[PDB]
Amino acid sequence: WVVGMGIVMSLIVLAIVFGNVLVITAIAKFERLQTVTNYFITSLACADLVMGLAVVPFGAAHILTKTWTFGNFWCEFWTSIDVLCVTASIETLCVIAVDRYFAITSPFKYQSLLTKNKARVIILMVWIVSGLTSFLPIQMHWYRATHQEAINCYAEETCCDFFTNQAYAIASSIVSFYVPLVIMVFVYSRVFQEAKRQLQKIDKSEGRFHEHKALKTLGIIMGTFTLCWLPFFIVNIVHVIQDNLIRKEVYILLNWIGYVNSGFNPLIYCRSPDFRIAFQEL
Amino acid sequence: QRNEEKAQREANKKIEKQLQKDKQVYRATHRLLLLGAGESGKSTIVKQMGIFETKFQVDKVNFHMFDVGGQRDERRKWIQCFNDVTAIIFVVASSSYNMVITNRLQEALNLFKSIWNNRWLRTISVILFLNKQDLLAEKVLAGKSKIEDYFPEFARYTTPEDATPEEDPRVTRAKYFIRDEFLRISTASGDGRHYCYPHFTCAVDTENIRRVFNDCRDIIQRMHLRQYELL
Amino acid sequence: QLRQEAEQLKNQIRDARKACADATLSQITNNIDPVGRIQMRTRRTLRGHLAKIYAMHWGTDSRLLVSASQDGKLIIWDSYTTNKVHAIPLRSSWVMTCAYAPSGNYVACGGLDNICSIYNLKTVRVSRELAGHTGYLSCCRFLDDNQIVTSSGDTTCALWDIETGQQTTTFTGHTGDVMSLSLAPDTRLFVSGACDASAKLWDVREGMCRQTFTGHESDINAICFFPNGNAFATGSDDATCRLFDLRADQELMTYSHDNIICGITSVSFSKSGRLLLAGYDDFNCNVWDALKADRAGVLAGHDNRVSCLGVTDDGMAVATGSWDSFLKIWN
Amino acid sequence: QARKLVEQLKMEANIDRIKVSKAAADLMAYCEAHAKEDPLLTPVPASENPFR
Ligand SMILES: Nc1nc2c(ncn2[C@@H]2O[C@H](COP(=O)(O)OP(=O)(O)OP(=O)(O)O)[C@@H](O)[C@H]2O)c(=O)[nH]1
Ligand SMILES: CN[C@@H]1CCc2c(ccc(O)c2O)[C@H]1O
Numbered sequence: 001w002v003v004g005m006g007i008v009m010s011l012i013v014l015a016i017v018f019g020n021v022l023v024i025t026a027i028a029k030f031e032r033l034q035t036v037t038n039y040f041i042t043s044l045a046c047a048d049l050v051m052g053l054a055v056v057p058f059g060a061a062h063i064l065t066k067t068w069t070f071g072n073f074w075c076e077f078w079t080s081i082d083v084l085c086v087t088a089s090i091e092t093l094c095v096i097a098v099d100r101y102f103a104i105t106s107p108f109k110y111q112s113l114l115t116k117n118k119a120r121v122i123i124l125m126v127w128i129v130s131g132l133t134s135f136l137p138i139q140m141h142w143y144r145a146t147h148q149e150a151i152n153c154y155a156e157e158t159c160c161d162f163f164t165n166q167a168y169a170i171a172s173s174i175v176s177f178y179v180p181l182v183i184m185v186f187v188y189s190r191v192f193q194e195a196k197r198q199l200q201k202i203d204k205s206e207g208r209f210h211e212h213k214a215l216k217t218l219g220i221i222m223g224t225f226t227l228c229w230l231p232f233f234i235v236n237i238v239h240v241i242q243d244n245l246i247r248k249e250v251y252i253l254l255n256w257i258g259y260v261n262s263g264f265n266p267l268i269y270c271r272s273p274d275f276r277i278a279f280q281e282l
Numbered sequence: 283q284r285n286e287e288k289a290q291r292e293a294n295k296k297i298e299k300q301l302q303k304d305k306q307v308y309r310a311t312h313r314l315l316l317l318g319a320g321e322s323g324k325s326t327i328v329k330q331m332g333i334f335e336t337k338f339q340v341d342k343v344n345f346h347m348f349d350v351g352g353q354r355d356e357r358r359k360w361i362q363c364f365n366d367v368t369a370i371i372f373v374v375a376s377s378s379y380n381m382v383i384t385n386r387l388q389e390a391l392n393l394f395k396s397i398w399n400n401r402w403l404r405t406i407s408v409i410l411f412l413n414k415q416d417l418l419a420e421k422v423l424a425g426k427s428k429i430e431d432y433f434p435e436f437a438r439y440t441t442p443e444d445a446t447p448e449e450d451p452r453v454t455r456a457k458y459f460i461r462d463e464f465l466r467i468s469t470a471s472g473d474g475r476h477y478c479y480p481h482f483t484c485a486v487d488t489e490n491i492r493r494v495f496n497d498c499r500d501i502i503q504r505m506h507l508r509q510y511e512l513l
Numbered sequence: 514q515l516r517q518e519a520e521q522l523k524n525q526i527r528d529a530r531k532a533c534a535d536a537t538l539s540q541i542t543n544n545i546d547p548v549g550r551i552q553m554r555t556r557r558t559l560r561g562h563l564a565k566i567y568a569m570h571w572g573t574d575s576r577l578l579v580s581a582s583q584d585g586k587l588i589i590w591d592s593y594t595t596n597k598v599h600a601i602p603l604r605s606s607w608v609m610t611c612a613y614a615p616s617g618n619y620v621a622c623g624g625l626d627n628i629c630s631i632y633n634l635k636t637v638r639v640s641r642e643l644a645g646h647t648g649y650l651s652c653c654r655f656l657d658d659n660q661i662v663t664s665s666g667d668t669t670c671a672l673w674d675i676e677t678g679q680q681t682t683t684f685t686g687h688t689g690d691v692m693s694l695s696l697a698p699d700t701r702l703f704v705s706g707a708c709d710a711s712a713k714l715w716d717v718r719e720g721m722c723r724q725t726f727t728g729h730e731s732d733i734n735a736i737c738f739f740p741n742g743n744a745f746a747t748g749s750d751d752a753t754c755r756l757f758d759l760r761a762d763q764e765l766m767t768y769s770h771d772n773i774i775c776g777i778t779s780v781s782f783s784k785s786g787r788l789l790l791a792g793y794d795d796f797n798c799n800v801w802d803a804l805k806a807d808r809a810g811v812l813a814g815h816d817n818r819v820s821c822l823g824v825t826d827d828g829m830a831v832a833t834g835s836w837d838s839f840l841k842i843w844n
Numbered sequence: 845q846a847r848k849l850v851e852q853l854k855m856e857a858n859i860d861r862i863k864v865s866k867a868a869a870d871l872m873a874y875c876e877a878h879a880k881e882d883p884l885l886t887p888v889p890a891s892e893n894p895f896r
Contacts, residue, residue, distance in 0.1 A: 032816055100510060104503065104510070107499065107503050107506060108343055111309050111310060191512070194507070195512045195513055198507060201500070202477070204444075205479075206477070207444075208442070209466065209470075213511065213512065214513065217510075217511050218512075290594060290596045290598075293596070294596045297599075297600050298561070298597065301561060301600070308563055308564075332605075332649075333607065333625050333626055350625075352625070352626070352627050352647070352649070353648055355666075357689075357708070359666070360666075363583070363609075366565075366583075515846040516846065518850050519850050522853040522854060525857065529857065529861070530861065533862070533863045533864065534863075534864055535864050535865040536864055536865050536868070537864065537868075541868045541869065542868070545872070548885065551885075553884075556895040557895065592895075593894060723856070724856060725856065740874075740878070741874050743867070743870065744871060758871075760862050761861055761862060761864055762861045765864070783882060783884050783885070784881065784883070784884065785878045785879045786875055786878070787875050803871075803875070828882060829883050829888075829893075829894065829895070842895060844893065844895045844896065
């Protein structure tokens with residue numbers, strides 16, 4: 001089964017890199033895709049590409065060989081990169097949702113509200129907060145556990161596992177996945193209300209001569225992200241509170257299901273005639 | 283040689299800095315085009331609340347309107363310049379069915395159809411004002427003039443159930459027939475790319491600027507909703 | 514009675530030029546060697562305009578040029594170093610044409626306000642304003658520093674005296690809007706293409722029409738003189754280009770293709786007159802062979818419709834403008 | 845208006861025109877003679893090209 005399992009993990013790496021490089025090259029090469037909204041998509045694509053290049057291969061090798069060989073420093077560096085890439089990708093979807101909210105709800109002030117300098121400042125701030133949550137606590141050994149098994153895991157050189165305390169796990173869950181969930185829920189409820197009211201107006205003024213699309217689009221956008229990332233961030237909180245309820249295999253499987261989400265963003269945020277024509281040209 | 287190159291770069295920086303301030307003002311203003319059927323009373327609408335330009339501001343939003351009077355011909359070669367405006371304002375005198383002047387309502391309908399079906403105005407909405415309502419009401423209440431004599435389709439029309447009359451039923455039926463004459467042309471040609479907003483306007487109205495503001499807001503909101511694949 | 518004579522007169526004119534068609538230009542140039550394949554690449558890209566671009570005119574020194582845009586600016590560039598030299602704001606935001614004086618001291622402008630404005634570059638403030646046209650201006654070309662010819666949408670052209678601001682002479686006879694004009698190399702004759710699908714040859718000094726050409730099917734959009742001065746080319750929105758000869762008083766060749774259905778916005782000749790460059794509505798430019806009528810190249814680097822096109826006096830570069838607010842230099 | 849249109853046609857119809865075999869030859873000779881200094885037909889070396 002090792003031969004078969006290694007085949008599947010090889011296709012995941014290829015799918016993530018192929019889609020993300022195509023989006024980055026298409027935006028940079030062509031001048032019609034230089035809009036303000038595309039900067040957030042570029043940042044998200046860069047984060048997903050870094051994830052696919054740096055996290056999936058080493059994790060797959062660790063799973064397949066059942067042993068860590070790169071030492072006690074590269075394990076911690078890999079963990080820091082993992083947390084940094086996961087945190088900075090979920091928080092860009094929040095920025096995209098807020099951008100659409102401001103575009104639709106307040107159309108007259110949208111041009112004044114958003115500017116290229118403001119977009120750059122927001123992106124840099126998001127990446128800085130992502131870096132503070134991952135590298136700073138991990139590299140300073142503030143996330144370390146206390147039980148004897150964790151002590152042995154940290155002492156051994158061929159072992160590279162994940163053990164953490166309650167405070168760090170709880171805090172990291174909230175910044176990466178919970179504050180951004182309620183924000184997008186609140187945004188998209190209002191967006192749906194606006195779309196429905198406009199449809200009602202059009203029907204009232206023009207009905208005699210003549211909400212599936214909005215519902216379907218919002219359902220896709222919400223469902224993909226939620227189904228990909230919710231079970232992992234639930235079991236992340238549960239394991240610290242109950243030690244014997246969650247196994248390691250379930251933890252790894254849910255984490256990998258979450259990793260898979262990086263290969264679906266081009267299929268969701270890059271469906272438009274301007275992008276399809278660009279892809280055809282290349 | 284060396285000094286001349288630095289001198290040119292100094293002037294470019296000053297010019298490029300001026301173009302940044304101009305771009306902020308240009309992107310925050312909305313342009314409107316005003317049209318008419320020839321004797322539609324559009325001058326009064328401008329007065330109360332080559333080329334003639336006017337500027338006004340409502341709710342801290344800048345609008346800027348265009349009226350063309352220097353060119354008068356049946357062929358509009360210059361109409362392709364106005365393909366980046368927010369909306370077009372069309373003014374028509376609804377109380378001129380009997381005035382042959384071939385009647386003026388048919389000419390106005392033909393002009394509206396020509397403007398709607400244009401290779402360049404394929405994404406521009408129209409705000410329609412049906413002017414001179416009091417004259418229409420008086421002439422309809424007068425028994426002598428009959429619309430069905432000039433418009434034979436009026437012999438088989440009934441007032442829509444989903445209507446909002448204030449008014450004797452006859453004038454309401456006439457108004458809704460005239461509005462539907464434009465709506466039936468509007469609906470067929472376009473598919474979601476642009477719409478039409480018809481209004482009933484008189485000589486004593488003062489809420490026309492509010493109507494333009496709300497129609498522009500709806501136009502931009504619908505444009506964004508369609509762009510984001512939500513409509 | 515009078516209309517009968519006009520029909521009779523138009524009958525013999527067709528017969529008068531029918532006996533002069535000994536052969537066609539295509540037959541004579543069958544043995545000539547093909548030009549081959551011509552490929553050009555973009556050398557410069559000019560940015561700074563906030564809206565779509567309508568007009569463009571090269572300088573006599575083949576270094577500087579001017580351009581006009583709907584946002585209300587008139588920017589003078591430096592094609593070599595890509596440096597903005599001037600930026601003149603306009604009173605009216607609707608501009609349709611611009612011109613650059615042969616001496617380099619003045620720049621003209623015009624549009625939907627039926628007024629031509631002259632600016633003093635080496636002094637930048639408004640110098641003169643010319644009024645009297647009853648339609649939108651379509652084109653304007655400088656004869657000298659003290660006289661300029663303009664065409665408008667009131668089916669008339671005029672010759673102005675800048676010092677006094679009065680029309681020295683007026684040219685009448687067209688039935689539709691005049692869309693473009695072009696001056697002869699010696700500045701003694703000029704041609705105009707109008708919306709009635711006809712072109713006319715005028716005389717600046719005397720002031721009457723000489724010849725009329727009616728080969729096209731729809732409105733004529735562009736016109737240009739052959740470098741020799743004995744021929745000219747036109748372009749209409751029926752996807753055809755035609756070459757007319759003055760001494761033969763008829764059409765020589767037609768440049769069209771079955772895969773082209775869009776209109777034509779501008780035409781221009783090369784330094785030797787061998788190549789013919791025309792801009793189209795389908796977002797790109799094409800290059801023809803004047804003596805053989807076959808395609809030789811395509812310039813497809815623009816995102817919106819190409820509206821203007823020009824070739825330097827020394828013929829080293831070709832500049833095009835489009836509706837995406839960008840200018841490009843092709844060499 | 846009718847008289848003016850008739851007068852113009854009579855004035856225009858009385859001109860001398862040469863055959864096509866001469867005009868085509870003239871344009872061909874001019875192109876052949878002046879094709880030497882046509883930078884667009886034959887690309888110039890980058891040393892003498894101000895735009896590259
Ligand atoms: N009762 C009534 N009269 C109107 C109305 N609009 C214009 N008029 C009449 O029009 C007369 C003056 O003409 P204008 O208001 O300038 O209309 P207009 O000259 O036809 O405007 P244009 O033809 O578009 O240039 C006034 O004396 C009014 O009696 C209207 O809405 N109601
Ligand atoms: C090694 N896997 C880590 C474990 C904990 C964790 C992840 C991602 C985001 C977070 O905020 C976390 O706290 C996972 O990617």
